[PDB]
Amino acid sequence: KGEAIRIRSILRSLIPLGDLVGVISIAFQMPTIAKDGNVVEPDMSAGF
Amino acid sequence: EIQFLRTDDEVVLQCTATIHKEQQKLCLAAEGFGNRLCFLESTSNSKNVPPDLSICTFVLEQSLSVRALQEMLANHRTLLYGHAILLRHSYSGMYLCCLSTSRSSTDKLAFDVGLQEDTTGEACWWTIHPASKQRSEGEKVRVGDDLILVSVSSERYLHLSYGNGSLHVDAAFQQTLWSVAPISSGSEAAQGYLIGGDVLRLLHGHMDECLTVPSGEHGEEQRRTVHYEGGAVSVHARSLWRLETLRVAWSGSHIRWGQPFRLRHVTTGKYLSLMEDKNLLLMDKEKADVKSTAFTFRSSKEKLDVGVRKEVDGMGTSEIKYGDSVCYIQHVDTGLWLTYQSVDSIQRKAIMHHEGHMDDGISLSRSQHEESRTARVIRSTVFLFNRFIRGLDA
Amino acid sequence: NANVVVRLLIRRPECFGPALRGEGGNGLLAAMEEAIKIAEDPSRDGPS
């Protein structure tokens, strides 16, 4: 379908594949254990 | 009354550019040979620099509805708003299209606009839409209307790109109002009759000589001289002259006696001009201005001096006949007549003199389309290869 | 609805945000990285 091909091409033009691959490659912040043993947990609502 | 756009009509797509708080009119132009990308040609400054409408003219070949176009893709009509049209470039014979490639002129969404050789596919079809509410879908398209062109393949507008330093045309999502100025109507055109934009030869004597420039020197300073010569010049490309009117709209109409025009040597691309010394010289497009490069065809050498006539918004009457009609070339600003020097490959120099001689009549011989295209291709190839040679020398 | 929304969004390109403005804007990965830097910078994140 020409409409479907055109819409897919438009979306491909909007978003390069490299951008998606890089954003997926972005690393996360990890919950760590402090020297006391309590969990130092990042606030996910303020981060990636 | 109002007249409507039809198929097989020659038109130019004009856009209005406001840079530094001032207006320019720019025609969509393309040099199909050796280049595909479209550009812009200024027509607002016609007085000081002639525009090149030969590469700007387009022909409305087909005008089908959206459903008819989709049926074709799966497998003199008046233009209607909402129709998908096929624009064929008059000079190159190619078609305006969405190139599906981007120069990435800091605009990711925009595609480039250029010429394509194949009509197959949806890249060469453009839907036409009204500029204002005064027109509606299905309404007949009128000559004075402004239009919005949408690419069928990319659903993008024919857009005028301000952001980059040079003015560009590209298929983007911002809208640009395109006026469709009529150039020619093939059906109304009369055969054997002179019309604007023609490539022709100016035969002087007993059907013998041609107005031409020197050949073997290969030096443009020596080539700028204009003379009368007989022999194989009548079949060579040097004797080819473009007849260009001083108007954009209806430039392709019939030429009348006393209508001012510019003569362009096709091979060199330079315009004929009377210099202050009263000699004939070919000079550049930038230097070519109305006062010096304007010439008229007259039926008799007697100083009738008819004057300015109302300008016709159509083909008008066919007055000047190819071969049959005897024409006298007069400079408009000075009133001088173009006459051979008559001094001793005849090679009689062409000068301007205020009464001339008894035999200054000029017959006109139209050139074939193949010959004209070959001459313009020769000019373009010469220009590009000279640039290449200069770069290699540097 | 998908086709209509895509058409409207591409007609108004500013709906895609500063990264995807399509004129002088950086990529989606750059936008994500700048957002990361904003999130881990307290001054640019909070009202202050």
In C14-43, the residues whose Cβ lies within 8 Å of chain A are 16, 20, 27-29, 32-33, 35-36, 39-40
Angle between helical axes of A2-14 and C2-11 (0-180°, round to 10): 50
Minimum distance, in Å, between the CA of residue B103 and any CA atom of chain A: 13
Rounded-to-integer distance, Cα B310 and Cα B47, Å: 19
| A18 in contact with C, Cβ within 8 Å | yes
Question: Hey, how many other C-beta atoms are within 10 angstroms of the C-beta on B181?
Answer: 22
8 A C-beta contact, residue B333 and residue B291? yes
Q: Do C20 and A48 touch (CB under 8 A)?
A: no
- Which residues are CB-contacts of B32 (< 8 A; sequence separation ≥ 6)? B55, B89, B91, B92, B93, B94, B115
Instruction: Considering only the beta carbons, identify the residue of A6, A9, A13 that sits closest to B108.
Output: A13
Nearest CA to B10 out of B259, B188, B176 is that of B188
Beta-carbon contacts below 8 Å between B and C: 16
Q: Do B122 and A14 touch (CB under 8 A)?
A: no
Specified resolution (Å) = 2.6
Question: Hey, how many other C-beta atoms are within 10 angstroms of the C-beta on B180?
Answer: 23
Rounded-to-integer distance, Cα B41 and Cα B24, Å: 10
Rounded-to-integer distance, Cα B125 and Cα B118, Å: 11
From chain B, the residues in CB contact with C6 under 8 A are: none
SS3 B305: coil
Q: Do B109 and C22 touch (CB under 8 A)?
A: yes
- The region, left, alpha or beta by phi > 0 then psi within -120 to 50, assigned to residue B293 is alpha
Q: How far is CA B90 from CA A32, B5, B148, B224, B241, in A?
A: 72, 17, 21, 29, 18
Q: Which residue has the tokens 């040679």?
A: B389
- Tokens found for residue B379: 């000019």
- Rounded to the nearest 10°, the torsion over CA B127, B133, B139, B144 is -80
SS3 B106: coil
From chain A, the residues in CB contact with B155 under 8 A are: 6, 10
Nearest CA to B320 out of B275, B371, B259, B229 is that of B259
Q: Do A2 and B122 touch (CB under 8 A)?
A: yes
Nearest CA to B4 out of B80, B70, B68, B69 is that of B80
8 A C-beta contact, residue B55 and residue B30? yes
Nearest CA to B172 out of C25, C18, A5, C12 is that of C12
8 A C-beta contact, residue B315 and residue B253? yes
Rounded-to-integer distance, Cα B239 and Cα B232, Å: 10
- Tokens found for residue B194: 């002179």
8 A C-beta contact, residue B87 and residue B59? yes
Rounded-to-integer distance, Cα B377 and Cα B371, Å: 10
Rounded-to-integer distance, Cα A34 and Cα A29, Å: 15
Mutation to test the C interface, candidates B108, B151, B152, B176, most C Cβ within 10 Å? B108
Instruction: Considering only the beta carbons, identify the residue of A2, A6, A13 that sits closest to B109.
Output: A13
